């Protein structure tokens, strides 16, 4: 399949992502590394991602998340769940069983299997922040480990978050690497220690 662009594009609304401050305790379930621009998370656990805008986009704006393989040799392959997890019957009633990325706690979620590129993505309406908040948080879940055989096969992925109009035109784009693993805290610490040493 054709490779969706990963180029950062803040756009006219100044679209940026934010992440909670987490540490590297071995018990942590999701932890973001600013140095690596990389989220480390466990399978099927909440991954909060904050949407920040400098100006409010118009009604009908949407927020799409899509995984792509980070390495050039794998970029043209659609990111999918492994057959074992696809068949394990763990859906929430809406997410197709093959989709890696789910959204939890959103009544207006839509799951797309692109009719032409076969890529999967998950989209929700953009909602402005509520009273007292400065950003909007989406709760993602990743439904396979990076190591799953027949799925990610130990290959790193990026998540691309796009702000789009109702018709799919690009308003903004950001991305971050993801590792889905048993012990995100240890893996983040190891990768950061390797980076800094």
Binding residues: 82, 85, 144, 148
Choosing from 51, 79, 103, 148, the residue that interacts with Zn ion (CB under 5 A) is 148
Which residue lies nearer to Zn ion by CB, 39 or 144? Answer: 144
| Residue 100 touches Zn ion, criterion: CB under 5 A | no
| Residue 180 touches Zn ion, criterion: CB under 5 A | no
Six token digits for residue 154: 């130990």
| Residue 47 touches Zn ion, criterion: CB under 5 A | no
Q: Write down the least CB distance from residue 142 to Zn ion, Å.
A: 10
| Residue 178 touches Zn ion, criterion: CB under 5 A | no
| Residue 144 touches Zn ion, criterion: CB under 5 A | yes
Question: Contacts with Zn ion in 48-77 (CB under 5 A)?
Answer: none
CB of 52 within 8 A of CB of 135?
yes
From 20, 21, 9, 15, select the one nearest 52 (Cα to Cα).
15
Q: Which residues bind Zn ion (CB under 5 A)?
A: 82, 85, 144, 148, 151
């Amino acid at each position: 399949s054709s490779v969706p662009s990963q180029k950062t594009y803040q756009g006219s609304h100044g679209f940026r992502l934010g992440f909670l401050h987490s540490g590297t305790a071995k018990s942590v379930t999701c932890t973001y590394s600013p140095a690596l621009n990389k989220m480390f998370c466990q399978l099927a656990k909440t991954c909060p991602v904050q949407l920040w805008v400098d100006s409010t986009p118009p009604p009908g704006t949407r927020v799409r998340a899509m995984a792509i393989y980070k390495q050039s040799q794998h970029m043209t392959e659609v990111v999918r769940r492994c057959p074992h997890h696809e068949r394990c019957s763990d859906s929430d009633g809406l997410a197709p069983p093959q989709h890696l990325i789910r959204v939890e706690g959103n009544l207006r979620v839509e799951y797309l299997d692109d009719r032409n590129t076969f890529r999967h993505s998950v989209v929700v309406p953009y909602e402005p922040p509520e009273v007292g908040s400065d950003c909007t948080t989406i709760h993602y879940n990743y439904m396979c480990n990076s190591s799953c055989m027949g799925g990610m096969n130990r290959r790193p992925i990026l998540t691309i978050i796009t702000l789009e109009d109702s018709s799919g035109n690009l308003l903004g784009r950001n991305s971050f690497e993801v590792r889905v693993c048993a012990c995100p805290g240890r893996d983040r610490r190891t990768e950061e220690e390797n980076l800094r040493k």
